[PDB]
Amino acid sequence: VVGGLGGYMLGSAMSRPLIHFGNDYEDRYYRENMYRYPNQVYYRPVDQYSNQNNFVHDCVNITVRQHTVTTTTKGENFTETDMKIMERVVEQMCVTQYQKESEAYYQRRAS
């Protein structure tokens, strides 16, 4: 069911990053469910031009599409809290591999 995301790179394991969900509702809501998180994340390979403030849609959107479109077919439309927490949490995991694997290319590399 690919052809247009078909080429997105993905991380090798990274899950349940656990944010400061300093809420009642938008905290417990995810906390009771939090086991079902995706194994990994998608990203485009890092090659110059470090951005997050705009290169968040072009790395989180895709990674959230690949989780919501698999649920929407099941008779769901990801209500705004489920979606908020998704783009919010898929942000800090999809940034973490940007902000931890780039310096690795410069100084580590091949792991």
Short mmCIF file of N, CA and C in Angstrom, two decimals:
data_model
loop_
_atom_site.label_atom_id
_atom_site.label_comp_id
_atom_site.label_asym_id
_atom_site.label_seq_id
_atom_site.Cartn_x
_atom_site.Cartn_y
_atom_site.Cartn_z
N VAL A 1 0.83 -1.21 0.00
CA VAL A 1 0.00 0.00 0.00
C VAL A 1 0.87 1.27 0.00
N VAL A 2 1.99 1.24 -0.73
CA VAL A 2 3.04 2.24 -0.73
C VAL A 2 3.21 2.80 -2.15
N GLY A 3 4.26 3.57 -2.38
CA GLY A 3 4.65 4.14 -3.67
C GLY A 3 5.08 5.60 -3.56
N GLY A 4 4.75 6.26 -2.44
CA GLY A 4 4.92 7.69 -2.23
C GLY A 4 5.62 8.01 -0.91
N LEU A 5 5.41 7.19 0.13
CA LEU A 5 6.30 7.12 1.29
C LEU A 5 7.36 6.02 1.14
N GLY A 6 7.25 5.23 0.08
CA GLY A 6 8.03 4.03 -0.18
C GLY A 6 9.46 4.44 -0.49
N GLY A 7 10.28 4.56 0.55
CA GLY A 7 11.66 5.02 0.48
C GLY A 7 12.07 5.73 1.76
N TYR A 8 11.12 6.15 2.60
CA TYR A 8 11.37 6.66 3.94
C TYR A 8 12.23 5.71 4.73
N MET A 9 13.29 6.28 5.31
CA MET A 9 14.12 5.54 6.22
C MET A 9 13.45 5.47 7.55
N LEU A 10 13.90 4.49 8.33
CA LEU A 10 13.38 4.31 9.66
C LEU A 10 14.49 3.98 10.66
N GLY A 11 14.29 4.37 11.92
CA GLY A 11 15.18 4.08 13.03
C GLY A 11 15.17 2.57 13.32
N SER A 12 16.04 2.08 14.20
CA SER A 12 16.31 0.65 14.37
C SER A 12 15.72 -0.01 15.62
N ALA A 13 15.11 0.83 16.44
CA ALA A 13 14.34 0.61 17.67
C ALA A 13 14.34 1.92 18.43
N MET A 14 13.16 2.42 18.78
CA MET A 14 12.96 3.51 19.71
C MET A 14 11.47 3.63 19.96
N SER A 15 11.06 3.52 21.22
CA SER A 15 9.66 3.56 21.59
C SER A 15 9.45 4.23 22.96
N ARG A 16 8.17 4.34 23.35
CA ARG A 16 7.63 4.92 24.59
C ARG A 16 8.55 5.96 25.25
N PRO A 17 8.71 7.18 24.69
CA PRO A 17 9.69 8.15 25.19
C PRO A 17 9.31 8.79 26.53
N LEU A 18 8.03 8.76 26.89
CA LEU A 18 7.45 9.24 28.14
C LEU A 18 7.77 10.70 28.45
N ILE A 19 6.90 11.58 27.96
CA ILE A 19 6.90 13.02 28.17
C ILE A 19 6.31 13.34 29.53
N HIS A 20 6.70 14.51 30.05
CA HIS A 20 6.04 15.26 31.09
C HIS A 20 4.61 15.62 30.64
N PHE A 21 3.67 14.70 30.83
CA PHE A 21 2.24 14.81 30.60
C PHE A 21 1.64 15.37 31.89
N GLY A 22 1.99 16.59 32.27
CA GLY A 22 1.52 17.28 33.47
C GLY A 22 0.04 17.66 33.37
N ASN A 23 -0.78 16.70 32.96
CA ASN A 23 -2.23 16.75 32.86
C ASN A 23 -2.86 15.71 33.79
N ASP A 24 -4.19 15.76 33.88
CA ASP A 24 -5.09 14.71 34.33
C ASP A 24 -5.55 13.91 33.11
N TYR A 25 -6.41 14.50 32.27
CA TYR A 25 -7.09 13.81 31.18
C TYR A 25 -6.09 13.36 30.11
N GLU A 26 -5.45 14.31 29.43
CA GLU A 26 -4.50 14.06 28.33
C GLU A 26 -3.25 13.30 28.80
N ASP A 27 -3.11 13.06 30.11
CA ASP A 27 -2.11 12.18 30.68
C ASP A 27 -2.68 10.76 30.75
N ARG A 28 -3.65 10.51 31.64
CA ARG A 28 -4.16 9.17 31.92
C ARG A 28 -4.66 8.47 30.67
N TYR A 29 -5.29 9.24 29.77
CA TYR A 29 -5.82 8.79 28.50
C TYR A 29 -4.77 7.99 27.73
N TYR A 30 -3.53 8.49 27.64
CA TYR A 30 -2.49 7.81 26.88
C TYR A 30 -1.85 6.76 27.77
N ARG A 31 -1.65 7.08 29.05
CA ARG A 31 -0.98 6.21 30.00
C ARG A 31 -1.62 4.82 30.06
N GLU A 32 -2.95 4.71 30.10
CA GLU A 32 -3.59 3.40 30.16
C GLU A 32 -3.40 2.58 28.88
N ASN A 33 -3.06 3.21 27.76
CA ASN A 33 -2.99 2.59 26.44
C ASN A 33 -1.54 2.44 25.98
N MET A 34 -0.54 2.85 26.74
CA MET A 34 0.71 3.32 26.13
C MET A 34 1.58 2.17 25.57
N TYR A 35 1.15 0.91 25.72
CA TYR A 35 1.90 -0.28 25.33
C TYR A 35 1.97 -0.43 23.81
N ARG A 36 0.94 0.03 23.10
CA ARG A 36 0.77 -0.17 21.67
C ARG A 36 1.60 0.78 20.80
N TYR A 37 2.71 1.33 21.29
CA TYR A 37 3.40 2.36 20.51
C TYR A 37 4.18 1.65 19.40
N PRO A 38 4.45 2.36 18.29
CA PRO A 38 5.14 1.78 17.15
C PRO A 38 6.57 1.39 17.54
N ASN A 39 7.09 0.36 16.87
CA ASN A 39 8.39 -0.23 17.20
C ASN A 39 9.52 0.78 17.01
N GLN A 40 9.37 1.64 16.00
CA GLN A 40 10.39 2.51 15.43
C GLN A 40 9.72 3.82 14.96
N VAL A 41 10.44 4.64 14.19
CA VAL A 41 9.94 5.83 13.52
C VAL A 41 10.58 5.97 12.17
N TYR A 42 9.85 6.62 11.27
CA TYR A 42 10.31 7.01 9.96
C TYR A 42 10.96 8.39 10.03
N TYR A 43 11.92 8.66 9.14
CA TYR A 43 12.54 9.96 8.92
C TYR A 43 13.17 9.97 7.52
N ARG A 44 13.48 11.15 6.98
CA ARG A 44 14.30 11.26 5.77
C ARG A 44 15.76 11.35 6.24
N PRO A 45 16.73 10.64 5.61
CA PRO A 45 18.12 10.60 6.04
C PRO A 45 18.69 12.01 6.20
N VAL A 46 19.42 12.24 7.28
CA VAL A 46 19.92 13.56 7.63
C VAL A 46 21.12 13.89 6.72
N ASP A 47 21.01 14.93 5.91
CA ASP A 47 22.09 15.40 5.05
C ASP A 47 21.98 16.92 4.97
N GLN A 48 22.73 17.60 5.85
CA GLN A 48 22.80 19.04 6.03
C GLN A 48 21.43 19.68 6.38
N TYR A 49 21.40 21.01 6.50
CA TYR A 49 20.23 21.84 6.82
C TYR A 49 19.46 21.30 8.04
N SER A 50 20.06 21.42 9.24
CA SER A 50 19.39 21.08 10.50
C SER A 50 18.20 22.01 10.74
N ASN A 51 16.98 21.48 10.67
CA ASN A 51 15.78 22.18 11.11
C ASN A 51 14.96 21.25 11.98
N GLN A 52 14.21 21.83 12.91
CA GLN A 52 13.09 21.18 13.58
C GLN A 52 11.80 21.97 13.38
N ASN A 53 11.85 23.32 13.35
CA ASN A 53 10.63 24.14 13.48
C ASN A 53 9.68 24.04 12.28
N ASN A 54 10.22 23.60 11.13
CA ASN A 54 9.48 23.31 9.91
C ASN A 54 9.66 21.86 9.49
N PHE A 55 10.89 21.32 9.60
CA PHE A 55 11.17 19.89 9.50
C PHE A 55 10.75 19.19 10.81
N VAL A 56 9.48 19.37 11.16
CA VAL A 56 8.73 18.60 12.13
C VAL A 56 7.57 18.00 11.37
N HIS A 57 6.82 18.79 10.59
CA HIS A 57 5.76 18.23 9.77
C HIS A 57 6.37 17.16 8.86
N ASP A 58 7.42 17.49 8.11
CA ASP A 58 8.06 16.58 7.16
C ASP A 58 8.83 15.41 7.81
N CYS A 59 8.61 15.13 9.10
CA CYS A 59 9.14 13.95 9.78
C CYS A 59 8.17 13.33 10.79
N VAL A 60 7.21 14.09 11.33
CA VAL A 60 6.23 13.62 12.31
C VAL A 60 4.97 13.25 11.57
N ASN A 61 4.54 14.09 10.62
CA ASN A 61 3.30 13.90 9.88
C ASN A 61 3.26 12.50 9.30
N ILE A 62 4.31 12.14 8.58
CA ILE A 62 4.48 10.87 7.90
C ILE A 62 4.39 9.68 8.89
N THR A 63 5.12 9.79 9.99
CA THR A 63 5.25 8.85 11.10
C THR A 63 3.94 8.72 11.88
N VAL A 64 3.07 9.74 11.85
CA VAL A 64 1.75 9.74 12.47
C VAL A 64 0.72 9.18 11.47
N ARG A 65 0.83 9.53 10.18
CA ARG A 65 0.04 8.95 9.10
C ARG A 65 0.14 7.43 9.15
N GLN A 66 1.36 6.90 9.27
CA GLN A 66 1.59 5.46 9.29
C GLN A 66 1.06 4.75 10.56
N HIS A 67 0.33 5.44 11.43
CA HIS A 67 -0.29 4.90 12.65
C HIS A 67 -1.79 5.22 12.70
N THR A 68 -2.23 6.37 12.18
CA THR A 68 -3.63 6.79 12.22
C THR A 68 -4.36 6.15 11.06
N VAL A 69 -3.79 6.16 9.85
CA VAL A 69 -4.45 5.59 8.68
C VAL A 69 -4.68 4.08 8.89
N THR A 70 -3.87 3.42 9.73
CA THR A 70 -4.07 2.00 10.06
C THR A 70 -5.21 1.80 11.08
N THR A 71 -5.67 2.85 11.76
CA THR A 71 -6.74 2.82 12.74
C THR A 71 -8.00 3.40 12.15
N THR A 72 -7.89 4.31 11.19
CA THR A 72 -9.06 5.01 10.71
C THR A 72 -9.97 4.08 9.92
N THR A 73 -9.34 3.23 9.11
CA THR A 73 -9.96 2.10 8.44
C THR A 73 -10.75 1.22 9.42
N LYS A 74 -10.32 1.11 10.68
CA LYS A 74 -11.03 0.30 11.66
C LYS A 74 -12.28 0.97 12.24
N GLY A 75 -12.61 2.19 11.81
CA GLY A 75 -13.80 2.90 12.26
C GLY A 75 -13.41 3.81 13.40
N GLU A 76 -12.46 4.71 13.14
CA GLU A 76 -11.90 5.66 14.08
C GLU A 76 -11.55 6.91 13.26
N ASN A 77 -11.43 8.09 13.89
CA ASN A 77 -10.97 9.29 13.17
C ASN A 77 -9.94 10.10 13.94
N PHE A 78 -9.26 9.44 14.87
CA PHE A 78 -8.29 9.98 15.80
C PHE A 78 -8.75 11.34 16.34
N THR A 79 -9.56 11.36 17.39
CA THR A 79 -10.06 12.61 17.96
C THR A 79 -8.87 13.48 18.41
N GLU A 80 -9.11 14.78 18.62
CA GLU A 80 -8.03 15.75 18.67
C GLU A 80 -7.05 15.51 19.81
N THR A 81 -7.45 14.94 20.95
CA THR A 81 -6.49 14.66 22.01
C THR A 81 -5.59 13.50 21.59
N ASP A 82 -6.14 12.45 20.99
CA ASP A 82 -5.35 11.30 20.55
C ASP A 82 -4.31 11.74 19.52
N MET A 83 -4.74 12.58 18.57
CA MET A 83 -3.94 13.23 17.54
C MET A 83 -2.92 14.21 18.11
N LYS A 84 -3.30 15.03 19.09
CA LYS A 84 -2.39 15.99 19.71
C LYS A 84 -1.26 15.22 20.32
N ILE A 85 -1.56 14.34 21.27
CA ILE A 85 -0.56 13.56 21.97
C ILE A 85 0.27 12.79 20.93
N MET A 86 -0.31 12.24 19.85
CA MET A 86 0.46 11.57 18.79
C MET A 86 1.48 12.52 18.17
N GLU A 87 1.08 13.62 17.53
CA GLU A 87 2.05 14.51 16.88
C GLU A 87 3.03 15.09 17.91
N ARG A 88 2.60 15.24 19.17
CA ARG A 88 3.40 15.77 20.27
C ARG A 88 4.47 14.76 20.68
N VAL A 89 4.16 13.47 20.74
CA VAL A 89 5.07 12.46 21.26
C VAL A 89 5.94 11.88 20.16
N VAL A 90 5.34 11.71 18.99
CA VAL A 90 6.06 11.35 17.78
C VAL A 90 7.03 12.48 17.39
N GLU A 91 6.75 13.75 17.73
CA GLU A 91 7.75 14.81 17.67
C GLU A 91 8.96 14.45 18.50
N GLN A 92 8.84 14.30 19.83
CA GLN A 92 10.06 14.21 20.61
C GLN A 92 10.82 12.89 20.40
N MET A 93 10.22 11.84 19.84
CA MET A 93 11.01 10.70 19.36
C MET A 93 11.58 10.96 17.98
N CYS A 94 10.89 11.66 17.08
CA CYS A 94 11.47 11.78 15.77
C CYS A 94 12.56 12.86 15.76
N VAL A 95 12.55 13.76 16.74
CA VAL A 95 13.62 14.73 16.93
C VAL A 95 14.80 14.04 17.58
N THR A 96 14.53 13.15 18.54
CA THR A 96 15.62 12.56 19.32
C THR A 96 16.59 11.85 18.38
N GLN A 97 16.11 11.07 17.40
CA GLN A 97 17.03 10.46 16.45
C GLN A 97 17.67 11.49 15.50
N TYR A 98 17.09 12.67 15.28
CA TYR A 98 17.74 13.73 14.52
C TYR A 98 18.90 14.27 15.36
N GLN A 99 18.64 14.54 16.64
CA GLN A 99 19.51 15.25 17.55
C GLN A 99 20.49 14.31 18.25
N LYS A 100 20.39 12.99 18.04
CA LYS A 100 21.32 12.01 18.58
C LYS A 100 22.04 11.15 17.54
N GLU A 101 21.60 11.11 16.29
CA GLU A 101 22.25 10.31 15.24
C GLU A 101 23.03 11.20 14.25
N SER A 102 22.79 12.52 14.23
CA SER A 102 23.54 13.44 13.38
C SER A 102 24.98 13.57 13.87
N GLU A 103 25.18 13.91 15.15
CA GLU A 103 26.47 14.02 15.80
C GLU A 103 27.18 12.67 15.76
N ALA A 104 26.41 11.58 15.82
CA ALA A 104 26.95 10.25 15.61
C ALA A 104 27.56 10.11 14.22
N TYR A 105 26.91 10.55 13.13
CA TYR A 105 27.54 10.58 11.81
C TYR A 105 28.85 11.39 11.84
N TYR A 106 28.86 12.56 12.48
CA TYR A 106 30.07 13.37 12.54
C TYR A 106 31.19 12.69 13.33
N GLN A 107 30.92 11.98 14.43
CA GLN A 107 31.94 11.61 15.41
C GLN A 107 32.03 10.12 15.72
N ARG A 108 30.91 9.41 15.75
CA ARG A 108 30.85 7.96 15.88
C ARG A 108 30.91 7.41 14.46
N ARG A 109 29.78 6.96 13.91
CA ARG A 109 29.44 6.60 12.54
C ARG A 109 29.63 5.10 12.40
N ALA A 110 28.76 4.45 11.61
CA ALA A 110 28.47 3.02 11.72
C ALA A 110 28.22 2.66 13.19
N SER A 111 27.02 2.97 13.70
CA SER A 111 26.80 3.22 15.12
C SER A 111 27.82 4.24 15.60
#
